[PDB]
Amino acid sequence: DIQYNSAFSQLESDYGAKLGVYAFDTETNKEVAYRADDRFAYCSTFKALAAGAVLKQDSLEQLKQLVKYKKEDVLSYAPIAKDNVDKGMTIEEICSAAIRFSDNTAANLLLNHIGGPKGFKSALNQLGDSVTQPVHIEPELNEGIPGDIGDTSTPRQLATDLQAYTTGNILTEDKKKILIDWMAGNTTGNTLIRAGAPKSWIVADKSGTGPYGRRNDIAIVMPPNKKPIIIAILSTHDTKEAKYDDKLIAKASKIIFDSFTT
Amino acid sequence: DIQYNSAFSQLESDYGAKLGVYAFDTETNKEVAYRADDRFAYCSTFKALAAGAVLKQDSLEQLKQLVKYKKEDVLSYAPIAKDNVDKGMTIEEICSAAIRFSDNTAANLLLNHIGGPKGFKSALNQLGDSVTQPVHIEPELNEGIPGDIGDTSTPRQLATDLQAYTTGNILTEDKKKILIDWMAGNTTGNTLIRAGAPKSWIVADKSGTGPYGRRNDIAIVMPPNKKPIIIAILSTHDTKEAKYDDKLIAKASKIIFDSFTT
Ligand SMILES: [Cl-]
Ligand SMILES: [Cl-]
Ligand SMILES: [Cl-]
Ligand SMILES: [Cl-]
Ligand SMILES: [Cl-]
Ligand SMILES: [Cl-]
Ligand SMILES: [Cl-]
Ligand SMILES: [Cl-]
Ligand SMILES: [Cl-]
């Protein structure tokens, strides 16, 4: 549709950024797609998908397994894991810290639990995703130069994978609920898709950030009385030290919701 | 071959028992088969296969997960688990106790870890076994009446499954070694296949016993400098209170080894 294309292109001009959008409304089977098959560095958005992979791999009781790690594993952004070296963290605590706070040590422990980047890639391939290309752990995974394929995916692919874990048949009902609750109600989401959403449409998201002014958000959005909307919004700039502005994401989200509520 | 058929039939007459034998020599691709496709109650032999299923399901680190259980789970034969109610047991400790000592509480914890009898059946089906029919947990699983299909398999099928876990491509090299070591050097095996084996041919087995004078043994046998032999010997009697005699199994084993060393 040409109305939203113009609005997204205007955002690109206004913010000096490249924007990639894919949204799918499962109530109506409509989509919004803008550079939906272009690659972007996914940054921390992957943490929600890797937690999906944990849930698929593991029984519910395996989520209680305690993991011990060392001070050397504590990275410069590890707001939960830096305080749990002595006692350890369980798998579910690791997934929560990675999704709710984007803790990078928790994200590395999560990746270790599913076999490293190569194991995460294998899990995505088993789901039918041959586009997403995990290569690195934290902190390198958001630092790739433009043009790398490693640590990238497309808006469409990320949305498709999130839809598979949160609404498809990959996970049991109870595991879907665990994942969605991990993604719900976290402050890291406040300025992004949630900022552009209607107040009663519940947003459960995972944000991402990186150099090149990268700023991303993926989400499941749940309107009252309707089936959910799945969204991926990825964005980047040309130069490594560029600033990002979260309003780009919030405004892109408002365009998506307006397009689905006509 | 008609020579071993006569010898096995003579054992049946001598002991008043029904004997089922399947052995496969992977060095030479020869077999010994006697009622190999008849069903028998497998009794505790399954514990080795269920431990295979644990290894396939779980990462190496998941074997260290601690499991807590209650006094009510402690059965009348639980020589290891009865002493670990307070502190718990890890998954690898559970698999060891089930295989080395035939602990029935450990076997139930093992079954729980792979989804109950139905989960164990699903794992065997994924391996290509559509014959073995797990139904019960301990202690009921060895108590079925003759003619039940539940909790039965055939000599051929049990040997085929043991071969898949211990020598096939189901498990990594390290996991194969864990399984074979769990099965090696346990006293419960001393009077059975090991009693009929040459002294330098290393036997790693899992025994079984039940009412109807049921007495079974499955094993991987490793001659020096050669590829292994996989064996299942199952036996039963007609009446519930019948006694068994381990020499039936040891003598059947000697027939197998003589047949393979001509
Ligand atoms: Cl644990
Ligand atoms: Cl921190
Ligand atoms: Cl948390
Ligand atoms: Cl699942
Ligand atoms: Cl919200
Ligand atoms: Cl006991
Ligand atoms: Cl033990
Ligand atoms: Cl494996
Ligand atoms: Cl031996």
Automatic annotation (TrEMBL), chains A, B:
Organism field: Clostridium kluyveri (strain ATCC 8527 / DSM 555 / NBRC 12016 / NCIMB 10680 / K1)
Record-annotated Beta-lactamase class A catalytic domain positions: 20-234
GO biological process: beta-lactam antibiotic catabolic process; response to antibiotic
Taxonomic lineage from the root: Bacteria, Bacillati, Bacillota, Clostridia, Eubacteriales
Keyword terms, alphabetized: Antibiotic resistance, Hydrolase
Official protein name in the record: Beta-lactamase
Thylakoid recorded as keyword: no
Domain of life: Bacteria
EC nos: 3.5.2.6
Full protein segment contained here: 44 to 305 of 310
Family: Belongs to the class-A beta-lactamase family.
GO MF assignments: beta-lactamase activity
Catalyzed reaction equations: a beta-lactam + H2O = a substituted beta-amino acid
